[PDB]
Symmetry: C3
């Protein structure tokens, strides 16, 4: 693997390979003794559309492996860009660092950048459409907390029509055996038609539900996604929707499932749910470090341009 | 010690312990040898209200001990948070790093953060409630330059009514034996009533003075604090106040005291005072590194 | 050498010494294996007027030598400065780090800073009088790609009246033996009168040309500089000028020269020129790392507890 642009370029086999490397990295974090696997390496954080969350995650991961990091964000402003094209920037940075994590608005972006980069490119998503590293850490969370990915019952709650990370995860999961999916969402924000078709094409047991009460205590994972205002300009409307899908304490208690959420959470989950056993979104947050360490390591080794 | 939230959680004992560790750190620096005391460690700089000064200080300190640093500033915006609560952020960062230096506006902030952090939290002031690390380095400066903290005569000049770092230092000093305090300031910015009460309660010889000339050459330390235009909207007014408390060269020359100033200084001290022997504010600036190295080291070790 | 403020403080001898050290650094980079030459050192990036490019360059260089870096950009905004003078800041940072790369608007700036710094100061240009490190890497590019600096034919294209990096390079080159210079530019943006005088005073064969076709293929280096809008408020005019000096394919193919450009390039050079053999601007970009490593190393050693 010379780049990590899209989950659709990876198969269940490579996914597992990565999840394994991730577990190794997690254990290494427990040795607690200074790691130097990527000692003489430099990671370049090239963000056009800022994301302190994603940067810090990758930055931490790189440093945990003993590597160095140079950052270049807010490339969008003319002060941090200066009319220079992505292509020129990728070529210059490509010459400075050993690996690049890119975040660009345009669609080709990542893919294109990889074409001009003499270095591996990790796509931190083109804003949306494709964030591999996120999906991978999601899978790792399930693998880690549920003990397996195959044959699990997962339920997604929230904007499923525009939830990119949800789409990406639904696709990845569709590569595993017997995954039962539940899509809880407002009538308007249902899972894209074409996506459902792919699920059908892969003979995947799935159900579209309109209420959280439709779900049973047999779901293993409850993946909560945000529902932004832009979908319901009318406050009244938005109000009803928030209340209808908000994960409350009384609903969580005793449930078998674990609660995941890519963060940041704002309204999707009550704060009194945090201290409940099934709340796992912050653990999920942590898992991003080990899998990102896994990815950085792999990408660099796989392309030993020594 | 698992956190450093307020000076009021530390006693003279622990203070001295810290000042000692600080000295060690200072010496380790002077030798000029790559240090690796905090080698595999990561410090997280979580600033909601930006402060390049404080960040750089702690960043340098952490790196001098061979540690790594991840920074996250200006959270107070839809350019980094997007509506995520301090509590959620602390929990996420807490899982990434090994130690966190927080800077937040809200009062509980630091303390609260420490409750949700699975990692030590160093309070870089909840805006202007308590800035431990600063007071500690101030103490270190006195200890270092005067040779002792106990029984010294210190004079504070400037906005004493709102000078947070001054209040914090006055409290810490009140924990030492026989410290004589002088509060030089405009009739408008005198030291808070309740603070004076605490000083009285601790039987501390102190005097409020209106002029810099009301002092005698028996002062060991002259701690200069800033006085902002926001206190005297009227330029005329402000103008006269600036002149009245500005530390000038012909006032300094020959004086026993050392001049301290938490920085940045703008009007409080003339530039011709800089090269005078008693000017110690830049040295004080430096001392921040060793004491912060001391604090980072301790907090991490203490929490094995 | 205790500071690097201006190219006019360096002689051909020292220049070559630096270019040599630079080569060493370049080869050290090829030696894929962690360098620790500046292990316990800390570089401070003090930029009042931001420049993500220069910062990243120096940051990379410092980290490649195994050093650490603390950054402090745009103290220009009353947010990062607070009314504190450059002198006070230099003194404080001077006490924190081991070496400082300054970028300030005012003229004295760098020089002045060096007076109050208890640490070496590398001038990243007052943005209008001297950027040593850039000129040095330019020289290194010629030295490395052409094989020599002495007796070469170099042609500068673009705003030569305000091109600071061009002026700095023209001066440095004037210290070498038999360098033939060509100044291709619009009648308005001709090389400053006083500069031409210095060239005359040093008996330097030079020609001022108005067209790129005025150049014969006996040229070794074509240094392309930008021509910003502010020089031709009238779009018509500007468009006119852009087309007249734009380096196109049809013009480059088969030419003996190598093309240099300090970057970022916007209009000055067509993208189809990039993959042509004589295109060397991105290589030039890279060379900044080795020479900056060279400079950082030297400045720190030259001042090792003197």
């Amino acid at each position: 693997m010379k780049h990590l642009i899209s989950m659709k370029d990876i198969g269940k086999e490579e996914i597992l390979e990565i999840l394994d490397e991730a577990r190794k990295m997690e254990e290494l974090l427990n040795t607690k003794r200074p790691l130097k696997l990527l000692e003489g390496k430099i990671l370049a954080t090239v963000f056009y559309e800022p994301s302190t969350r994603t940067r810090l995650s990758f930055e931490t991961a790189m440093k945990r492996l003993g590597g160095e990091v140079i950052t270049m964000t807010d490339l969008k402003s003319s002060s941090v860009a200066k009319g220079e094209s992505l292509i020129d920037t990728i070529r210059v940075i490509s010459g400075y660092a050993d690996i690049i994590v890119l975040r660009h608005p345009s669609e080709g972006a990542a893919r294109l950048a990889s074409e001009y980069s003499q270095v591996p490119i990790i796509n931190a998503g083109d804003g949306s459409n494709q964030h591999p590293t996120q999906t991978l850490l999601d899978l790792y969370t399930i693998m880690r907390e549920i003990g397996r990915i195959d044959g699990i019952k997962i339920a997604f709650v929230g904007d499923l029509k525009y939830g990119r990370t949800v789409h990406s995860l639904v696709y990845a999961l569709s590569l595993f055996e017997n995954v039962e999916m539940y899509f809880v969402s407002p009538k308007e924000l249902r899972l894209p038609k074409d996506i459902i078709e792919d699920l059908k094409a892969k003979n995947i047991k799935f159900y579209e539900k309109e209420s959280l009460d439709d779900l049973d205590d047999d779901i293993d994972v409850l993946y909560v996604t945000r529902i932004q205002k832009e979908r319901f300009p009318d406050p009244n409307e938005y109000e009803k929707v928030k209340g209808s899908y908000k994960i409350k304490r009384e609903y969580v208690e005793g449930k078998k499932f674990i609660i995941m959420h890519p963060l940041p959470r704002v309204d999707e989950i009550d704060y009194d749910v945090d201290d409940l056993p099934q709340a796992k979104y912050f653990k999920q947050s942590f898992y991003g470090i080990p899998v990102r360490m896994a990815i950085l390591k792999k990408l660099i080794e796989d392309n030993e341009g020594e």
